């Protein structure tokens, strides 16, 4: 066989230990999911420093905690805008997930609170910026570099899927790099708890699995498709399916055809053909052997999964970091003051926040 006795026993034992870790992690998540924390700080505890990113809901600001001096990333959501944008459920869901999960590559919600106008989620500040920026700058990552990041996503999805969470929002724009060079996942508005199927059209065109495009009921395998797209983009510098307009992207996605740069290793192409598999009965991560088909693939043969989880692997790239509060890895944005109305807006909608 492919493994002698020692290697097979070691792998079996490792896979059983994963099961044991995940069963405990589910116990812990379900406790926090049923009894969420709330109202653990307030706005005048923080000085606002700089906008790190903006979206249709509001924005994320670098803030400094006045007493501790600690920097954080504060997501500010305009309640009236959230309601107009039809995002009440997503917003409440994101906060509920963030307060309940616990994994080294998932951003930690340190405080949350609300006032008459806005919702606030105060997260650890991840100073390295988006993977997207580094990928476009460097061009493409080497296969060892791409693999170091990919392994973290595999483990994070293994974790999330054990909690019946489908992630659905994977792309380099949504992965931050921390001071040690490891990945942080921050966005959970599109994540959903579901043990079976779900049907919402959501995601980013380049990263959509065919069964989403085709308006099918779908499951957590769409995350493994998205991992395939991410690994391809990290290693190529561009995604596997692109075009001028989304409709053309979708035609390519559903076609069952993918082409690879000549510099891709055969091991990499083999993994990507099994992740970017239009046929759900054949897609890695969706088979009887589950995530083990991915973790045990030749392209990951040099990956020490436990060492990645323990953050004991030396990162291939450490972002520049001039000190706490350094924002140089983030873009510059127009700074709009934040107002709280004298009149509470949208109170009932957000009582759970």
């Amino acid at each position: 066989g492919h493994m002698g006795n020692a290697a097979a026993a070691k792998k079996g034992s490792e896979q059983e230990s994963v099961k044991e870790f995940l069963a405990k992690a589910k116990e812990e998540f379900l406790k926090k999911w049923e009894s969420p924390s709330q109202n653990t700080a307030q706005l005048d505890h923080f000085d606002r420093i700089k906008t790190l990113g903006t979206g249709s809901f509001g924005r994320v600001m670098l803030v400094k905690h006045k007493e501790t001096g600690n920097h954080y990333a504060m997501k500010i959501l305009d309640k009236q805008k959230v309601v107009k944008l039809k995002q009440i459920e997503h917003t409440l869901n994101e906060k509920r997930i963030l307060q309940a999960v616990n994994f080294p590559f998932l951003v930690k919600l340190e405080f949350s609170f609300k006032d008459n106008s806005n919702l606030y989620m105060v997260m650890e500040y991840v100073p390295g910026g988006e993977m997207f920026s580094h990928l476009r700058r460097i061009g493409r990552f080497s296969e060892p570099h791409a693999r170091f990041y990919a392994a973290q996503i595999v483990l994070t999805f293994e974790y999330l899927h054990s909690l019946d969470l489908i992630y659905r929002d994977l792309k380099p724009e949504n992965l931050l790099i921390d001071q040690q060079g490891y990945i942080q996942v921050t966005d959970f508005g599109f994540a959903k708890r579901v043990k079976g199927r779900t049907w919402t059209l959501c995601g980013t065109p380049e990263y959509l699995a065919p069964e989403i495009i085709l308006s099918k009921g779908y499951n957590k395998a769409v995350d493994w498709w998205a991992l395939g797209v991410l690994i391809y983009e990290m290693a190529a510098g561009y995604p596997p399916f692109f075009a001028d307009q989304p409709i053309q992207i979708y035609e390519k996605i559903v076609s069952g055809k993918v082409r690879f740069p000549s510099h891709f290793s055969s091991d990499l192409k083999d993994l990507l053909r099994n992740l970017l598999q239009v046929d759900l009965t054949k897609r890695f991560g969706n088979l009887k052997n589950g995530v083990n088909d991915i973790k045990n693939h030749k392209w990951f043969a040099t990956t020490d999964w436990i060492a990645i989880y323990q953050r004991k692997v030396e990162a291939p790239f450490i972002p520049k970091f001039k000190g706490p509060g350094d924002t140089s890895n983030f873009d510059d944005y127009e700074e709009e003051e934040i107002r709280v109305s004298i009149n509470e807006k949208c109170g009932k909608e957000f009582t759970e926040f």
Binding site: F132, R136, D169, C202, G203, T204, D244, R259
Partner: peptide, 19 residues
């Protein structure tokens, strides 16, 4: 080249979700 096609697509910047 494929890279040139990627540049030509106009989708080299940050990509929005369907939302």
């Amino acid at each position: 080249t494929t890279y040139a096609d990627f540049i030509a697509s106009g989708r080299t910047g940050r990509r929005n979700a369907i939302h």
